[PDB]
């Protein structure tokens, strides 16, 4: 069992944690963008991850989510954890 969130899933969720739907375009291959560059707090990354934890069946330790600079890593946390141990 490993329902992997896709680009779109991460996108929608990550916009959702910004509060209002401003619309930081996170479509296509936005995985090379950076959270620091898009003004994201690591606290917010934890918040982002927290949502995905309960949704997909993963658990991301507090400090881990603060160590993700690019969206690819945050996505890879969920995807990877499910593939590793679900
Ligand atoms: P991440 O480690 O890139 O997140 C860094 C953040 C954006 C949280 C950064 O340290 C910040 O916003 N600092 C504000 C100053 C402070 O003391 N914040 C307390 C946060 S609980």
Short mmCIF file of C-alpha atoms and ligand atoms in Angstrom, two decimals:
data_model
loop_
_atom_site.label_atom_id
_atom_site.label_comp_id
_atom_site.label_asym_id
_atom_site.label_seq_id
_atom_site.Cartn_x
_atom_site.Cartn_y
_atom_site.Cartn_z
CA UNK A 1 0.00 0.00 0.00
CA UNK A 2 1.53 3.26 -1.16
CA UNK A 3 -0.75 5.91 -2.52
CA UNK A 4 1.79 8.44 -3.70
CA UNK A 5 0.87 12.09 -3.89
CA UNK A 6 1.65 13.53 -7.24
CA UNK A 7 2.86 16.93 -8.46
CA UNK A 8 -0.71 18.27 -8.40
CA UNK A 9 -1.35 16.92 -4.92
CA UNK A 10 1.72 18.57 -3.49
CA UNK A 11 0.87 21.73 -5.45
CA UNK A 12 -2.69 22.07 -4.15
CA UNK A 13 -1.73 21.21 -0.62
CA UNK A 14 1.27 23.54 -0.60
CA UNK A 15 -0.84 26.45 -1.86
CA UNK A 16 -3.45 25.57 0.77
CA UNK A 17 -0.88 26.03 3.56
CA UNK A 18 -0.13 29.54 2.32
CA UNK A 19 -3.54 30.45 3.51
CA UNK A 20 -5.47 32.09 0.77
CA UNK A 21 -5.23 30.90 -2.76
CA UNK A 22 -2.84 33.45 -4.10
CA UNK A 23 -1.56 31.12 -6.67
CA UNK A 24 2.08 30.60 -6.45
CA UNK A 25 2.43 28.64 -9.69
CA UNK A 26 3.69 25.28 -8.68
CA UNK A 27 2.82 23.41 -11.83
CA UNK A 28 4.98 21.39 -14.17
CA UNK A 29 8.37 20.78 -12.73
CA UNK A 30 8.53 23.20 -9.86
CA UNK A 31 10.64 20.84 -7.85
CA UNK A 32 13.76 22.91 -8.60
CA UNK A 33 12.24 25.94 -6.87
CA UNK A 34 13.10 26.59 -3.25
CA UNK A 35 10.96 27.09 -0.21
CA UNK A 36 13.23 29.88 0.98
CA UNK A 37 12.82 31.54 -2.40
CA UNK A 38 9.02 31.17 -2.39
CA UNK A 39 8.95 32.60 1.15
CA UNK A 40 8.00 29.45 2.98
CA UNK A 41 8.61 28.93 6.64
CA UNK A 42 10.06 25.61 7.78
CA UNK A 43 7.26 25.63 10.35
CA UNK A 44 4.95 25.82 7.36
CA UNK A 45 6.80 22.93 5.77
CA UNK A 46 6.13 20.90 8.88
CA UNK A 47 2.51 22.00 8.62
CA UNK A 48 2.49 20.96 4.95
CA UNK A 49 4.01 17.58 5.85
CA UNK A 50 1.61 17.14 8.84
CA UNK A 51 -1.31 17.27 6.45
CA UNK A 52 0.23 14.71 4.17
CA UNK A 53 1.17 12.42 7.08
CA UNK A 54 -2.38 11.74 8.13
CA UNK A 55 -3.59 11.71 4.53
CA UNK A 56 -1.10 9.23 3.05
CA UNK A 57 0.04 7.26 6.05
CA UNK A 58 3.46 8.60 6.85
CA UNK A 59 5.11 10.25 9.77
CA UNK A 60 7.76 12.88 9.34
CA UNK A 61 9.89 13.80 12.38
CA UNK A 62 9.84 17.53 13.34
CA UNK A 63 13.43 18.29 12.34
CA UNK A 64 13.21 16.45 9.00
CA UNK A 65 10.58 18.76 7.53
CA UNK A 66 12.77 21.71 8.47
CA UNK A 67 15.56 20.27 6.35
CA UNK A 68 13.73 20.39 3.03
CA UNK A 69 14.93 23.26 0.85
CA UNK A 70 13.29 22.26 -2.36
CA UNK A 71 9.71 20.89 -2.95
CA UNK A 72 11.24 17.74 -4.42
CA UNK A 73 12.60 16.79 -1.01
CA UNK A 74 9.29 17.37 0.78
CA UNK A 75 7.53 15.30 -1.91
CA UNK A 76 10.28 12.65 -1.70
CA UNK A 77 9.72 12.43 2.06
CA UNK A 78 6.15 11.24 1.63
CA UNK A 79 6.74 9.15 -1.53
CA UNK A 80 9.92 7.68 -0.15
CA UNK A 81 8.52 6.85 3.28
CA UNK A 82 5.57 4.98 1.74
CA UNK A 83 7.86 3.03 -0.55
CA UNK A 84 10.23 2.35 2.31
CA UNK A 85 7.82 1.42 5.06
CA UNK A 86 4.11 1.65 4.83
P1 LIG B 1 13.30 27.04 7.67
O1 LIG B 1 14.38 26.60 8.71
O2 LIG B 1 13.76 27.63 6.33
O3 LIG B 1 12.35 28.09 8.34
C1 LIG B 1 13.00 29.31 8.87
C2 LIG B 1 11.99 30.34 9.35
C3 LIG B 1 11.23 30.81 8.12
C4 LIG B 1 11.02 29.71 10.37
C5 LIG B 1 12.77 31.56 10.01
O4 LIG B 1 13.67 31.13 11.04
C6 LIG B 1 11.85 32.65 10.60
O5 LIG B 1 10.77 32.98 10.09
N1 LIG B 1 12.31 33.21 11.68
C7 LIG B 1 11.63 34.28 12.42
C8 LIG B 1 12.29 34.57 13.78
C9 LIG B 1 11.86 33.64 14.94
O6 LIG B 1 12.44 33.68 16.03
N2 LIG B 1 10.84 32.83 14.69
C10 LIG B 1 10.29 31.89 15.65
C11 LIG B 1 9.55 30.76 14.95
S1 LIG B 1 8.60 29.68 16.03
#
